[PDB]
Amino acid sequence: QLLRELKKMDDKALLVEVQLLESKTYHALSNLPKARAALTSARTTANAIYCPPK
Amino acid sequence: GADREVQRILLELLNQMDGFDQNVNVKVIMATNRADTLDPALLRPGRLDRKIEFPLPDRRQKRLIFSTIT
Amino acid sequence: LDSALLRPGRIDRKIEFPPPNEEARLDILKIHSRKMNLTRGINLRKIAELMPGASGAEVKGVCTEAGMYALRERRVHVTQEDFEMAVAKVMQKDSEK
Amino acid sequence: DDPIISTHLAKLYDNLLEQNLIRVIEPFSRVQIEHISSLIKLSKADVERKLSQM
Amino acid sequence: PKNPDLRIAQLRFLLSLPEHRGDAAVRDELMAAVRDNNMAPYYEALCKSLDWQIDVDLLNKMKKANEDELKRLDEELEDAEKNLGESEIRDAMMAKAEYLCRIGDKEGALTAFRKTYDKTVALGHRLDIVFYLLRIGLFYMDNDLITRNTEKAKSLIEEGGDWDRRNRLKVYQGLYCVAIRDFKQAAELFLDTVSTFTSYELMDYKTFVTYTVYVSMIALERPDLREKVIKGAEILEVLHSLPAVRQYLFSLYECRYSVFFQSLAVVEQEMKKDWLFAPHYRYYVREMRIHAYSQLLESYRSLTLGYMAEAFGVGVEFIDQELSRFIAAGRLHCKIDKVNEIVETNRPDSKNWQYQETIKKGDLLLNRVQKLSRVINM
Amino acid sequence: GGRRFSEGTSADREIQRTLMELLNQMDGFDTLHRVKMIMATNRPDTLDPAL
Amino acid sequence: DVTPNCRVALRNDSYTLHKILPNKVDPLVSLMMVEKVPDSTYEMIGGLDKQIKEIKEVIELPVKHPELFEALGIAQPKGVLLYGPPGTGKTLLARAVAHHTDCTFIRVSGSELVQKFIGEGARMVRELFVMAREHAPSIIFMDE
Amino acid sequence: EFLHAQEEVKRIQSIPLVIGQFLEAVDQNTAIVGSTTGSNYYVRILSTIDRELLKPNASVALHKHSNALVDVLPPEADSSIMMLTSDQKPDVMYADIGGMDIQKQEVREAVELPLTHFELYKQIGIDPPRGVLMYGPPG
Amino acid sequence: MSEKKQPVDEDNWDDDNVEDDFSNQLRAELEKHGYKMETS
């Protein structure tokens, strides 16, 4: 419901936040390959910003 | 005669630069301030492959260099 | 170039090189991937359809940086995550001059 | 506080067992299990099984 | 077009050697034979199968269609020497000559391969031709024509480091090593199981998994065995798919000394009716037997048949005769007693196995050089 | 000193190599000790930025 | 047997020729090694087949069949121009087709190393044709 | 007879040796060397030399008057001293450099990393580079 | 030549040694398992 709202615009640093928390919660709710893929989307998301300083 | 010697120095450098064995571990590091006055016969795949530049720093790098040196 | 070179009785053939398309980048990727240590179940068309019409030189860069990303993990095979991060790296380098 | 203590308890236990077994054996070869059962502070069933596994 | 070509030789093995198993094989052998326009490779099996009551027209119309398809290319050659490409004649009818050779016998192979081999300067086509040789020499089990260009291909491989031909020939030499009694090589060649493309010879990746477990349960004892097939994951998911594969693994690693011959009964009865194990399944069984008996007898020295009858199975006399033959076979040194009910072990077996293999290879090498040195000077 | 060139006259090559000898052996790997260097000229505009 | 540009053994006192020496220099090949283009072939240009057909019809067709052109009676062609974005196969196609049609690939762009290998560096650039008459099936290729 | 003849051959070196470099060889018992006197010679060789020890490019001992191949040298001929040998380290540590993470990491993977993990490149199929070039403004 | 005067007339072998062990007794030994699991 929200990634469609986010990738329609330009912003990228918030995709980091939502994909990161989804990589937390699928590990929490015991879905290991989906947590892997949701982490991988964040891995390739984080290599597109000049300043992700934290 | 001043340029012929530098010329054959470059020739010998290229010729022993090319065929080591493709297995002899000898890494060659070169560095100049000027990356414009280079005959591109060096800068070919096989001889000098990776290109690295050292640009001027920026705000975060200024902070880090300050924190280190000071 | 010169208009005096462009006399029609001077050059015989003039040959265009378009930037590569989806199938063209797919062929380029299936050539340059043939030297790595890949893994089954990899989708190359996703990788080709994440490129913004890259050059014929840059896909080789994607393969080499995929090799580097597999190397830093102390791994011996190359999976699609390394390719996607290599796509991110090359598309970050695309804004360098 | 660890998310998985199965790894840490069970597998570090699966190490620390033979980390004790190198202690209890290094003195002497012809060793009886019924007196080493007290030094290991454990029943001898999993001693026989785990040491056969060793 | 030799990709579906392996099921042919599969059924060639599967039909004739079991006597009662001779109906479904000849059914879908017909279903594969009267299409693809197959003519040559089945005259022996035609003398092994039935009369095929009308051989008169039903196959001669097929070979006439083959003649049309053949000399349309042999009258395309003059149309392709009009514009000499990369010898478009030979580049066209190389794979179509292997179509003709999928029809034909190995003479079309031995001339068309070496014909089109010296055409190209791009070695990928050479690699494809070498694949063609390896496959058809595997079809006629010509285990000597293929070992030439295994080496001649690894020369064409190892100008550096690649993906394609390295992993492909890993699969190819793995099948050749599992063809002969070579098991640690089969495990080392089947080590990969990661980038082994869903192929025509890998007609199921799952069958590739079954083979690489059916030789890795022999090859090494335990100093990578748990780490590959137990601590691994990419193999673990697909062995988690089939029950029977995971069955014997967790059996033998669990040491369930009675379900072993159940698992081995299923795997062995499939091993009977499976190709490239035909001189192999007999030594396989005693190999598994001694490999289980090793890890049994290693832990205990005060053991007997009174421990066998309840944790291993029944027929104490069968235990007796089996261990008697296997111990007196110079294998698994441990000494057994009569009615005092004692099976004692020899605690190191590393005195004469030290001395053993050197004399056992020097025997064959000296016997070689005897005759071969007396070959010269008449 | 000079500044730099597109290699106009062949004599300027040797001056540039001499200046790079200076630039190397004032920084190098074997660092100097106590060698204070006084440098004077009219117009430092014509000097090499590497110096 | 006294070829031009061949090493001979010379005795020292009388200066007499002693023996012809092998391992000739191959200056064109040395220049080629100095240049060191990527050596390519057909199978690594996948995705540009129409341009392949064009260069076939304009280069492979004069070499293998001059008399098709001389029967149809037009000028056999002599010039190819390649354009596109930089980095889309401008080199591998030329080098590869020149490799398959068996022509001595020559890339003289701008060095003076090259100007020493060709001639003595004296006056002009046309001496590449003097070295191209000796290896007559050859192709000359250039950058921007 | 033969062994004393072998050692009577061996009077050739003894203390006037001059150093050429091996260039080429015609065939068995005939080679080509170019001296450090600038010129280049067609010489004969001794039957003493084990022929494994030659034919890339080796500093080789020549006779003065006869100017012929005599002996092989061990690898030598200074690399401006040689390889700094004990203590000529610049004494600069890792954390002394501040904030150069991409560049330090890249120079690491280009130089320091293939120095050790050589066999990973042969398995992954990376073709690690031969030479690396740095540049930038002065300072 | 070599007329050899006539008044008179792995893959195969190591597992034939092993097959000489296998020959007379228990040829297709797979069922005798299931034969004797219920005997005793």
Ligand SMILES: Nc1ncnc2c1ncn2[C@@H]1O[C@H](COP(=O)(O)OP(=O)(O)OP(O)(O)=S)[C@@H](O)[C@H]1O
């Ligand atoms: N058809 C192709 N498919 C895939 N990669 C290619 C292809 N052609 C070239 N490359 C790669 O792209 C690089 C650059 O292509 P080139 O053929 O050298 O064109 P180019 O030299 O970039 O043209 P320039 O820069 O204007 S001289 C080559 O070094 C190859 O690695």
